[PDB]
Design a protein around this ligand. Structure first.
Ligand code: PAR
Ligand code: MG
Ligand code: MG
Ligand code: MG
Ligand code: MG
Ligand code: MG
Ligand code: MG
Ligand code: MG
Ligand code: MG
Ligand code: MG
Ligand code: MG
Ligand code: MG
Ligand code: MG
Ligand code: MG
Ligand code: MG
Ligand code: MG
Ligand code: MG
Ligand code: MG
Ligand code: MG
Ligand code: MG
Ligand code: MG
Ligand code: MG
Ligand code: MG
Ligand code: MG
Ligand code: MG
Ligand code: MG
Ligand code: MG
Ligand code: MG
Ligand code: MG
Ligand code: MG
Ligand code: MG
Ligand code: MG
Ligand code: MG
Ligand code: MG
Ligand code: MG
Ligand code: MG
Ligand code: MG
Ligand code: MG
Ligand code: MG
Ligand code: MG
Ligand code: MG
Ligand code: MG
Ligand code: MG
Ligand code: MG
Ligand code: MG
Ligand code: MG
Ligand code: MG
Ligand code: MG
Ligand code: MG
Ligand code: MG
Ligand code: MG
Ligand code: MG
Ligand code: MG
Ligand code: MG
Ligand code: MG
Ligand code: MG
Ligand code: MG
Ligand code: MG
Ligand code: MG
Ligand code: MG
Ligand code: MG
Ligand code: MG
Ligand code: MG
Ligand code: MG
Ligand code: MG
Ligand code: MG
Ligand code: MG
Ligand code: MG
Ligand code: MG
Ligand code: MG
Ligand code: MG
Ligand code: MG
Ligand code: MG
Ligand code: MG
Ligand code: MG
Ligand code: MG
Ligand code: MG
Ligand code: MG
Ligand code: MG
Lengths: 125, 138
RNA sequence: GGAGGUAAAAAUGGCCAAA
RNA sequence: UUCCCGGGCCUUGUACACACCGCCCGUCACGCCAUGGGAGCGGGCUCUACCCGAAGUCGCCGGGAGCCUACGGGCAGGCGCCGAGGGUAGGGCCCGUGACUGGGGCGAAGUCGUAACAAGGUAGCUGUACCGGAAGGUGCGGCUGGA
RNA sequence: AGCUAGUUGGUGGGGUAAUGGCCCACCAAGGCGACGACGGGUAGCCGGUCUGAGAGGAUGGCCGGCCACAGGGGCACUGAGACACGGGCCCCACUCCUACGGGAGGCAGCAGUUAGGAAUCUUCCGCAAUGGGCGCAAGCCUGACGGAGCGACGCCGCUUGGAGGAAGAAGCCCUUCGGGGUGUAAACUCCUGAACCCGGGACGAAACCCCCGACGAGGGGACUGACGGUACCGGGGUAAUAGCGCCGGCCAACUCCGUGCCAGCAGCCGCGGUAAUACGGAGGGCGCGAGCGUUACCCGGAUUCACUGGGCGUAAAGGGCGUGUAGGCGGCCUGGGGCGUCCCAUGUGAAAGACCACGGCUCAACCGUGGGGGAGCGUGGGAUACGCUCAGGCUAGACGGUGGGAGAGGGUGGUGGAAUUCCCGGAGUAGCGGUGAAAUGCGCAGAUACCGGGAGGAACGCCGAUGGCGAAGGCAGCCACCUGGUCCACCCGUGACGCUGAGGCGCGAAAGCGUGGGGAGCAAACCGGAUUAGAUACCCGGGUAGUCCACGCCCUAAACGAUGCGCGCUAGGUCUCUGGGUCUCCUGGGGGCCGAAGCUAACGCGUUAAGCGCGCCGCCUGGGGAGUACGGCCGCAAGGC
């Protein structure tokens, strides 16, 4: 554009929108599940991923992913939403923090315990 | 209608250096003579002279080139690699004495108009005037 | 000799997968 | 050597490249999500008109009635305008919700056909108009992104 | 996209410490708005903070400055100062007390409770210091403050030892079994010594006060510490927490076993369906280390809104075309002003923060003291090249004049011939049409082939082209009228009169719409005959809107050169259209091809640029959703922007 056009119209800012609507960018949100089930992934994959429809403290109701192997989440279990989507699950853009109020840590887990919320095991060594 | 007669003169020269001509005719004006005088004092051209073309005043700018190279593409090197206008009529550029650009660590010049007259980046910085940054020549 | 120029046929091929 | 099958050289077209046993289009069936319309319903903000209108400043009276140390005075008190707010009515914007309904995105292997890419077997595309389960067909005109 | 009743101005008043419609009475009809009023949404603002090479982008928490509020709302009183946070009045909501009629309360002060939330502290100590109020003073008050407490929340410092030590124990992992790795790692030997125990023990404090001196200057004397018996010094003295993430590429770190598109991982690309360095565990390794990872948010990378610093033939992007309003930009010469612009001087640009030095805490974090200019703005003085303005002059731009030229440029009226269809007449037969082949169809009711006459509508063969004209759509028989654009020669006149152009206005193929007319051929829809598994198609026979005219709408397109307009410069060769000349040849306008330099991602472009530059407008910012929905405007509708 010309210099006369820039002083008239100007340049537009980017203003990127959030990929996670957590009410002003809250890092975490507490909520209770409504239904616990499994959904199929996209074409490049095939399995039964454990998810849960969580109704949080803000009226919203979005499904979240349950990581690890084995859980204890029920229809009336309170969880904590973390964030981050699942590439293979359409609609799932959140994760459930393991080790919170009603979400227990992965049993027999030893490598990555900061994630999945597992305590430090002690075997006299 | 020559919206920018100063930048047009710089392009008549730029179009002649790529075709390697001896001289080219540019419209006559006292301000354009001050620009060509700096180009001749700095050693970018051989000089100029007030000529007459069909009864109209013109200025023949004798171009300057380097020695004839060897091998493929023996075209001689340019003494004026590129000349372009900075302060355009659509966006006027005015600089002081501290806000003067350094053209190639001093290897190139920057012609700019001041109240004292048409000076270079070195002359205007020594006299401490500055003004409208006309053009940079590298 | 330069343009204007000739159709009778006939559908389909599961998903993912080698620097 | 026209035709059927396979093959060689050059050229031409391609949206094919696990390479035409290729690619690919739309409808229909099922599931998830968001969104438009929808008899309407509910809430929030705001605007206009009028009715009532506390406290209080200001203005008038202070008299058939009050208190005062100087009285052509002061105070109490009475009236009036404005006025928080409340009420009635009608509008403006925004949001939530609603039987039903429209189209949309997304979801390994469901049904129907062959539209396009090789003159894709009717060159293709395109604006408009009509028709048709569906891609789409046809009319009029245009384009080379065809010969 | 329009807004405005105290609305804009005047006069006279009320009120104020004081101007002002701040409020009132009368008068005038004004005031604001694309330079974005009005309205909606969000938000306290700044010094600064974070990021960034810079320009910029993001942000306003501690600290400092200003503003605004003190349960929501209104109001005044006192007062130098308040419409007052711990003053007053009233209304509302809530809480408490009531002898039931009428009373009290306002943590957004310090702590602390409850609720909300992912989450944010002690109902601590002292007025010793600094500061504030009152008091002459003694002194009182001070949840300001100075401190202590909780919390890896951040930054900085420090410890979990140091030196030896096996060709290299045990266990565990790998293996080709020969061995390799954990690994000087461990045990073990010496040395030091964080913790802890004992003793000492502050700086921060000097005045106010008291004496000499005149309760002044000057000199002398005394009192006072929360932190706290903390820091710190000295002596003695124990080998004394390590965790977290990752190891397919990006990206540093590789092997075994278990599972087998299951379980699972995943920031992007993507791994897993029987030998996975990508899942889970093991060993080993890599990176950090009282931290390490995850989520959320800001900047960067992103030159991916491009001022520095981007693009639009085919990737996203040139408006369908023109005419023009505002605006933006503008040829050569001479002076006046000095607005922009530049220089100098001066004031301001608080402190803190940032930067550079030096220094205080044993170092650092932190903190103290110096130094350096910013940017902007006010004032005085100077410079005048350029941009601006004023005045004068000029001709190369632009327009005009005189004489000529070509053209399907447009509108109006008239007019010609060929061909098709139908009607009439004559002659004449047993088929004609149509296809790949057929069949519907037409035909002994006299069809098709032929001659003659008539009617009517539409389009104009040859010329004709790779041609011309127009801004675009678009324009083709012939004649006339009205009328637009354009080119050349003469250099005759005006004299900067110029370019572009948001908006507006006009034109705008085909289709479609309204009213009236017309309707020969063709032909959506429709009906038949074929084809096919099916044919709502392709082929064939019929056929209605429409195609045609007038007037009025509709505003779209592959409206294309997918290339906005104007100007200047940069080799040519060749064909062609059309003017001029001392018409061999030169020169000007226009339409093509091949191509110097150059440009391009390539194809290609290349004086008819997509090259080199300037001015102005329009448009792009990954794909689908989608040119959709909502709203607005336009339209009879279809529908358009
Ligand atoms: N924009 C998406 C739209 O998809 C449309 O197509 C949609 C359907 O037509 C299509 O359905 C396809 C079908 O075409 C095809 N012949 C068979 C196939 N199994 C179907 O697949 C669909 O359905 C199955 C379950 O039945 C799903 O598991 C699968 O994810 C889905 N793609 O799948 C699409 C939706 O996933 C059109 N292509 C078009 O309008 C557009 O591309
Ligand atoms: Mg959320
Ligand atoms: Mg897979
Ligand atoms: Mg992992
Ligand atoms: Mg099928
Ligand atoms: Mg296939
Ligand atoms: Mg697969
Ligand atoms: Mg051969
Ligand atoms: Mg096929
Ligand atoms: Mg393939
Ligand atoms: Mg709705
Ligand atoms: Mg009296
Ligand atoms: Mg009211
Ligand atoms: Mg509604
Ligand atoms: Mg719906
Ligand atoms: Mg087709
Ligand atoms: Mg096809
Ligand atoms: Mg076909
Ligand atoms: Mg066909
Ligand atoms: Mg086809
Ligand atoms: Mg069509
Ligand atoms: Mg049809
Ligand atoms: Mg056309
Ligand atoms: Mg008034
Ligand atoms: Mg706010
Ligand atoms: Mg940068
Ligand atoms: Mg409160
Ligand atoms: Mg007073
Ligand atoms: Mg107060
Ligand atoms: Mg209080
Ligand atoms: Mg408190
Ligand atoms: Mg809670
Ligand atoms: Mg004190
Ligand atoms: Mg004091
Ligand atoms: Mg304190
Ligand atoms: Mg061993
Ligand atoms: Mg050691
Ligand atoms: Mg002391
Ligand atoms: Mg004294
Ligand atoms: Mg010691
Ligand atoms: Mg890491
Ligand atoms: Mg590596
Ligand atoms: Mg294995
Ligand atoms: Mg990995
Ligand atoms: Mg692993
Ligand atoms: Mg970023
Ligand atoms: Mg940037
Ligand atoms: Mg730029
Ligand atoms: Mg770009
Ligand atoms: Mg395209
Ligand atoms: Mg394009
Ligand atoms: Mg165009
Ligand atoms: Mg103008
Ligand atoms: Mg000028
Ligand atoms: Mg000036
Ligand atoms: Mg400062
Ligand atoms: Mg030091
Ligand atoms: Mg007859
Ligand atoms: Mg017969
Ligand atoms: Mg006849
Ligand atoms: Mg003349
Ligand atoms: Mg003049
Ligand atoms: Mg114009
Ligand atoms: Mg039209
Ligand atoms: Mg038409
Ligand atoms: Mg028509
Ligand atoms: Mg119709
Ligand atoms: Mg009609
Ligand atoms: Mg017909
Ligand atoms: Mg078939
Ligand atoms: Mg037909
Ligand atoms: Mg075209
Ligand atoms: Mg066109
Ligand atoms: Mg276009
Ligand atoms: Mg030419
Ligand atoms: Mg080249
Ligand atoms: Mg070319
Ligand atoms: Mg334009
Ligand atoms: Mg459309």
């Amino acid at each position: 554009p010309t210099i006369n056009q820039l002083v008239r119209k100007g340049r537009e800012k980017v203003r990127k929108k959030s990929k996670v609507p957590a009410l002003k960018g809250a890092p975490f949100r507490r909520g209770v599940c409504t239904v616990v089930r499994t959904v199929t992934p996209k074409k490049p994959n095939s399995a039964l991923r454990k998810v849960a429809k969580v109704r949080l403290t803000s009226g919203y109701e979005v499904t979240a992913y349950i990581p690890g192997e084995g859980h204890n989440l029920q229809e009336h279990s309170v969880v904590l939403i973390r964030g981050g989507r699942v590439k293979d699950l359409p609609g799932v853009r959140y994760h459930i923090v393991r080790g919170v109020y009603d979400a227990a840590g992965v049993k027999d887990r030893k490598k990555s315990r900061s994630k999945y919320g597992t305590k430090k095991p002690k075997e006299a060594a | 209608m020559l919206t920018d007669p100063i930048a047009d003169m710089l392009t008549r020269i730029r179009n002649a250096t790529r075709v390697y001509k001896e001289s080219t005719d540019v419209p006559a004006s006292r301000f354009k003579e001050e620009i060509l005088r700096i180009l001749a004092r700095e050693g970018f051209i051989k000089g100029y002279e007030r000529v007459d073309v069909d009864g109209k005043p013109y200025l023949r700018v004798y171009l300057k080139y380097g020695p004839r190279r060897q091998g493929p593409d023996p075209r001689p090197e340019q003494v004026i690699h590129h000349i372009r206008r900075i302060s355009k009529p659509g966006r006027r550029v005015y600089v002081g004495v501290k806000e003067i650009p350094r053209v190639r660590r001093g290897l190139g010049i920057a012609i700019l108009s001041t109240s004292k007259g048409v000076l270079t980046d070195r002359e205007a910085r020594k006299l401490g005037v500055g003004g409208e940054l006309i053009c940079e020549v590298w």
